[PDB]
Amino acid sequence: ALQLIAEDLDETSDPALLARCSDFFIEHSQYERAVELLLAARKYQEALQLCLGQNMSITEEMAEKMTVAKDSSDLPEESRRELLEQIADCCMRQGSYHLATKKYTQAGNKLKAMRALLKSGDTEKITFFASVSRQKEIYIMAANYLQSLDWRKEPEIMKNIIGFYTKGRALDLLAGFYDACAQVEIDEYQNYDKAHGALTEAYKCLAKAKAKSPLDQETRLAQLQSRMALVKRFIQARRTYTEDPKESIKQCELLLEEPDLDSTIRIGDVYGFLVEHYVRKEEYQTAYRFLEEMRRRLPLANMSYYVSPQAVDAVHRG
């Protein structure tokens, strides 16, 4: 019953109740819940002393809760570093190489820590403190591993590959990754605002890179600028949707009259925005005409990325 009631307690409930409950659970050997209740009461020293006095496994959520942010006034930096080393040492004894690494690097020990993360393979923990660590080799090694992944499922991986090759001064790898990022952000996630960000940064990066052939660099820069202009016109179409949906649609229909559009904006996403609009108005008949025109232009592309399965089915039910 104490476990069930303390799950209806949380980090928003009264610190005095959390303290009474934690004191009771400490007297009754329920150390996991006592630590969760102490961390909910912000008692980081008592929580870590209770973990160390009973050799407790430190979970990623527990270790995150014990992470006092640099922007907080709650602890001095020396005690913060000692706490983070003690957590990291504990995670290292516990075989959690990836988490030990995040906590050693928040504490200032770095290159052995990064090699320990790469051996563990943990994708999110690789993102978190190559961000923290601020060193060249760490950014390149982390980005090179993260680039191998199906990163589409974890947008933090994408933000971090970008941050890393930019901070790691590896500009052609970054320009290729921002271009592929704009492509997988557009083609599998339909997020043109984040992809225009990615193209703007691809342009900055490729312009600052030392290419082996200036004609290839200039033609890719001109292609990126043309892509940015077309993508910005599609972003203007999405933004105008909440002000004039008829003009927003007309701009999307006009964008479907643009030549070679698919090299810049997937023809399927424009159809997907048109289809999502007509589905959101329950105008499944016009939505169906747009899905037929999409299926005519794109036989090979998987429709389930460009249009939600619920929106495709929504029309086939109209």
From Swiss-Prot:
Q: Where are the TPR repeats?
A: 15-48, 81-114, 268-301
The signal peptide, as residue positions, is: none
Changing C252R has the effect of:
In SRTD9; disease phenotype consistent with Mainzer-Saldino syndrome
What biological process terms from GO does the record include?
cilium assembly; determination of left/right symmetry; embryonic brain development; embryonic camera-type eye development; embryonic cranial skeleton morphogenesis; embryonic digit morphogenesis; heart development; intraciliary retrograde transport
Q: What's the impact of mutating L291P?
A: In RP80; uncertain significance
* Localization of this protein: Cytoplasm, Cytoskeleton, Cilium basal body; Cytoplasm, Cytoskeleton, Microtubule organizing center, Centrosome; Cell projection, Cilium
Gene Ontology cellular-component terms for this entry are: axoneme; centriole; centrosome; ciliary basal body; ciliary tip; cilium; cone photoreceptor outer segment; intraciliary transport particle A
| SS bond list | none
Q: Say which domain of life the source belongs to.
A: Eukaryota
Question: What keywords appear on the UniProt entry?
Answer: Cell projection, Ciliopathy, Cilium, Cilium biogenesis/degradation, Cytoplasm, Cytoskeleton, Disease variant, Phosphoprotein, Repeat, Retinitis pigmentosa, TPR repeat, WD repeat
Where does it mainly reside? cytoplasm
Quaternary state and partners of this protein? Answer: Component of the IFT complex A (IFT-A). IFT-A complex is divided into a core subcomplex composed of IFT122:IFT140:WDR19 which is associated with TULP3 and a peripheral subcomplex composed of IFT43:WDR35:TTC21B. Interacts (via C-terminal region) with IFT122 (via C-terminal region). Interacts with TTC25. Interacts with TTC21A.
Medical condition linked? Short-rib thoracic dysplasia 9 with or without polydactyly: A form of short-rib thoracic dysplasia, a group of autosomal recessive ciliopathies that are characterized by a constricted thoracic cage, short ribs, shortened tubular bones, and a 'trident' appearance of the acetabular roof. Polydactyly is variably present. Non-skeletal involvement can include cleft lip/palate as well as anomalies of major organs such as the brain, eye, heart, kidneys, liver, pancreas, intestines, and genitalia.
Q: What does this protein do?
A: Component of the IFT complex A (IFT-A), a complex required for retrograde ciliary transport and entry into cilia of G protein-coupled receptors (GPCRs). Plays a pivotal role in proper development and function of ciliated cells through its role in ciliogenesis and/or cilium maintenance. Required for the development and maintenance of the outer segments of rod and cone photoreceptor cells. Plays a role in maintenance and the delivery of opsin to the outer segment of photoreceptor cells.
Protein name, entry field: Intraflagellar transport protein 140 homolog
